[PDB]
Amino acid sequence: DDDRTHPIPDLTGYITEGQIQLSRELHRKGIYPPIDPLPSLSRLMNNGVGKGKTREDHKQVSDQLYSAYANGVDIRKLVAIIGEDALTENDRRYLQFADAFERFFINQGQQNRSIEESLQIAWALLSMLPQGELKRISKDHIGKYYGQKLEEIWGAP
Amino acid sequence: DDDRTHPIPDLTGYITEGQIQLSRELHRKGIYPPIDPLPSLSRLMNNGVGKGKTREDHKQVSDQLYSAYANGVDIRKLVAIIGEDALTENDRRYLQFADAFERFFINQGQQNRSIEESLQIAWALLSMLPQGELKRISKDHIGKYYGQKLEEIWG
Amino acid sequence: MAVIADPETAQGFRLAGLEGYGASSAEEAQSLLETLVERGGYALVAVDEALLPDPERAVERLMRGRDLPVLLPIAGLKEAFQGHDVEGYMRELVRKTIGFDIKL
Amino acid sequence: VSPTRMNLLQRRGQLRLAQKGVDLLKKKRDALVAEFFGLVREAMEARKALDQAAKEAYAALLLAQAFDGPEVVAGAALGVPPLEGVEAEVENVWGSKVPRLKATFPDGALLSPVGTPAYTLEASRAFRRYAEALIRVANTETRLKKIGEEIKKTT
Amino acid sequence: PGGDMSEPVTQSTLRIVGAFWRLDASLAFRRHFPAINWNGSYSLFTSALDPWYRENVAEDYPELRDAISELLQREAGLQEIVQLVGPDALQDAERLVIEVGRIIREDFLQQNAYHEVDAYCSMKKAYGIMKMILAFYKEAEAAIKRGVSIDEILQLPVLERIGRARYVSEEEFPAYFEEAMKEIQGAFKALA
Amino acid sequence: PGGDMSEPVTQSTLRIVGAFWRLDASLAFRRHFPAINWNGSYSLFTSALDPWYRENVAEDYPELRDAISELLQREAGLQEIVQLVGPDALQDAERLVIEVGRIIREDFLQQNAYHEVDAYCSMKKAYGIMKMILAFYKEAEAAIKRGVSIDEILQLPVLERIGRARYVSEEEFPAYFEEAMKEIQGAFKALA
Amino acid sequence: PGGDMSEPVTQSTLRIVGAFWRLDASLAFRRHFPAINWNGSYSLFTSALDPWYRENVAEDYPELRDAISELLQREAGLQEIVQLVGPDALQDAERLVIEVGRIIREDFLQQNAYHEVDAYCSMKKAYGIMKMILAFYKEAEAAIKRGVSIDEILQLPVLERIGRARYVSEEEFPAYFEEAMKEIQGAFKALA
């Protein structure tokens, strides 16, 4: 009954390392796969990502994406009350970032994406934010990857 | 404990052909009989009403009264949040409709109202709303019966 | 729009085409103010701060359902030369607006 | 509330809804405070400009009354036409209606523009500048107060 | 028993059926039948029937159905704010979504089983109603960007044309649909 | 299971333990470690350890600890105004409390378990840190009583002497403490 | 157990009894004894005893009883508004009702079982107190319609006569009642 306190979800959480949660709200809007990034968690991420086993900018990019989407989903709720004009500029950038994220990153359809393509899309989505707003990412990766347009994935949404 | 989910009312509702449910809140205000119209139900209503049995406009008037009273009860919860002074006039119309309904239609005492008197009172109560709000009633019945005021009946 | 102040400046305020009344005491001021507001057409009323610092609460009974008369406290002729710091007045505005009494 | 599992789940959902609404209202309050503290500075600037205008207007009035005489100044005052109740056009702040005054008055159309007196017309110009300065303070202060009760309601 | 959906049989039926139509007592109280709880219902046969719908009804019917579902989801999302601050506190572009959702709920989903004409509804009639509602929504969102207040948009006479399309007979609907679409075109262009 | 403290296990444990170090993830989100809650934790061995404390550490230590506790408490009474009005708009008499409590949270409460010298702190080191923080607060309040701006106080060179006290060696600490005491005594009554 | 009125013993009792006097712990906390909750209690013998009341107490006793019941109901209705909006946001036509409800709650319903005199109360004394309270209410409403502020009415000295009335012995009451009745009218006519 979507009840996370039910015994089957509860006893599974004591033995397994995190969970991936599908969202019904994303499913009704036409997004597939409806994986909700906010309540999802992988507890062994830190020992698998990094230099020598994937690209070295993985962890900070993931943290920045999570932190930006968390602000976007709340700014989108505040818009319905206070209107779009009352926001500042960067709040409007976050509001557009959340919509672009849901349109391109999550809604991949039946495509097969390698890790490099996913990281390229992630860095293209972060490019719509101004430089220096990306607090979580170090300068070395920002100078190396920031600035690509989103028109590459726009040819196949 | 006024619990509708108790096994005895549950099975009685599953077996029988309707129920008449009294309300304690209406009884507290002095309304007799304190019949609550929303939880009540009559499954065999469709057989004994209509043209040639009671009158042609009975079925639609009942549904319109149900919808209007439901809207009034809904507004009664929003006024408890923001107050009546912030309401629009349309919502105040429904609120006053509910207040007049509970005091003039349900509250009848020991008198014996005929069916025609009850329908006349019901049409006198629907006239407090704009003519465009009656979506459930055909325009022929509206053109025939709509128009009376409530004060024209009493004395 | 009309103003209420000392009789010395009433002629000067009528010199600009405005409506001007003179007053010399507090109860005279409040009675004159209620006679001012009980009739319409008077969008703005100016009352000197030396005689009635807070006019919208002295007469609040007559406009609580009608925000048409805009009352305003103004500095008098004496204060125009002897000086007055607007910071205290703005702190008082912070007081009867939000009331935390914290501002620098 | 009848104790069932479904009712327990519904109440647990309602708790989350209230907890999210609290944070949303806090964000709205912060957004309102941001404009309030920006408007208070402009109110202060308007007040000090009003004081500056009042100083020179009152000095001119005193000097004109002292040297030209009181009777000639009074006659020049009676030689002016009165201003009407200029329009208080509506204005929207944060979803609420406020009046906005208009500074337009028939300058130059006032009778007796030039003639014998010398110190009275300068005082008239100073006083009409003072009158122009006053309405700006009025227009800013009313919006300041109207933001204030919105802060109070959100809190 | 007592409407408790956590019953062993109800949970046992949940895991072996391809569709699930959950009824609500709240909608039944206000005589809003068939009283289907849109939030807690689902159907797993939607994705497999698309080639039939594209052949027998229209080439763009799934797009209209997805648009209607998206609008209903948006209406459901904003209802958590209405219970917090009231309906009038919302912006105009969101009041439009609320009113369109209410229009859909009172016009398309509701059906009377004892009416002479409303008891049966073919697929093309529902397709016409959905197209009409979506066209009205597009014109209404066009009107908002032109500065038109929403308090007058709902006063247009085309809503009553939309409001009573249920009771039009199947042999009269093909002319009514083309009349109402022309009215929809005319009203909003003459609006501003 | 979900952070609920009404479980039978935690209720049974609470009845018998002498100390209760509650963790919370709100401070872990800020990378503030150790992330214990200092308004939810309690200890019952404080009143019995005082005779050992005033003999082995210093005479004023039981009296000094209450100063740190009250200083941390006073900001919890200022949390109802900071989310409404920005920190810079506060009066200086409250800005002082906010800043000294902040430096307490960021130098005394926090600790780096991975560092070479911060992973272990003897008791006299902590006592010197609390004494030095009280000296800072008392002299800053005395300067504030003379009508000075609090901005010049925040720019004082002794503030970085406050941050660096964590990373001094255990053998090297006393001379650093004496020098910091001299500098903080020189700073505030040199400023008029 | 635990004040739960849904237990089997309470529910089996309510089906048989003709009267139900419900106690409340909230009234007992603030020492408002006898702590009878007047909203949840009921009696089924009120209608049958009216002819006895009409000739053994007074011919208008049920009218006074109903007039006080409506005042209590209106006060309970306004108790949904006042607690979160503010008592001064109401109009005086409702603040008067609030104050009269407070007077009824504290001066009539309350009774001390351990006092020398208050432990026993005849019917005629209660009727006199009821008459005094209703007369005060009507005069206060007339004075409000004269445009007087409510605070000059709450500060009126005649209110203390009603508060001390229930401590007047059964012997003194027939003389106290006439003087209080004259004083109420005199004070409300002498008022502006």
UniProtKB/Swiss-Prot annotation, chain A:
Disulphide bridges: none
What is known about what this protein does?
Produces ATP from ADP in the presence of a proton gradient across the membrane. The V-type beta chain is a regulatory subunit.
Q: Which family does it belong to?
A: Belongs to the ATPase alpha/beta chains family.
Q: What is this protein called?
A: V-type ATP synthase beta chain
The record lists the organism as: Thermus thermophilus (strain ATCC 27634 / DSM 579 / HB8)
From Swiss-Prot, chain C:
Q: Which gene encodes it?
A: atpF
- Tell me which SUPFAM superfamilies the record gives: AtpF-like
Point out the signal peptide segment.
Answer: none
> Known Gene3D superfamilies for this protein?
6.10.140.810, ATPase, V1 complex, subunit F
Q: Which organism is it from?
A: Thermus thermophilus (strain ATCC 27634 / DSM 579 / HB8)
Chain segments annotated as transmembrane: none
**From what superkingdom does this record's organism come?**
Bacteria
Single biological process term from Gene Ontology: proton motive force-driven plasma membrane ATP synthesis
Provide the family line: Belongs to the V-ATPase F subunit family.
> Taxonomy-wise, where does this protein's organism fall, top ranks first?
Bacteria, Thermotogati, Deinococcota, Deinococci, Thermales
Question: What's the protein here called?
Answer: V-type ATP synthase subunit F
| Molecular function via GO | ATP binding; proton-transporting ATP synthase activity, rotational mechanism; proton-transporting ATPase activity, rotational mechanism
Q: Which InterPro entries match?
A: ATPase_V1-cplx_f_g_su (IPR008218), ATPase_V1-cplx_fsu_bac/arc (IPR022944), ATPase_V1_fsu_sf (IPR036906)
Function according to Swiss-Prot or TrEMBL: Produces ATP from ADP in the presence of a proton gradient across the membrane.
Q: Which UniProt keywords apply?
A: ATP synthesis, Hydrogen ion transport, Ion transport, Transport
**Pfam families linked:** ATP-synt_F
- HAMAP family in the record: ATP_synth_F_arch
Swiss-Prot record, chain D:
Q: Which family does it belong to?
A: Belongs to the V-ATPase D subunit family.
Query: What is the gene name?
Result: atpD
* Keywords linked to the UniProt accession: ATP synthesis, Hydrogen ion transport, Ion transport, Transport
Output the lineage of the source organism: Bacteria, Thermotogati, Deinococcota, Deinococci, Thermales
Q: What does this protein do?
A: Produces ATP from ADP in the presence of a proton gradient across the membrane.
Protein name, entry field: V-type ATP synthase subunit D
One of its GO biological process terms is: proton motive force-driven plasma membrane ATP synthesis
What GO molecular function annotation could you give as one example from this UniProt entry? proton-transporting ATPase activity, rotational mechanism
Q: Which domain of life is it from?
A: Bacteria
UniProtKB/Swiss-Prot annotation, chains E, F, G:
What task does this protein carry out?
Produces ATP from ADP in the presence of a proton gradient across the membrane. The V-type alpha chain is a catalytic subunit.
Source organism phylogeny: Bacteria, Thermotogati, Deinococcota, Deinococci, Thermales
Originating organism: Thermus thermophilus (strain ATCC 27634 / DSM 579 / HB8)
Which protein is depicted?
A: V-type ATP synthase alpha chain
Query: What family does the database annotate?
Result: Belongs to the ATPase alpha/beta chains family.
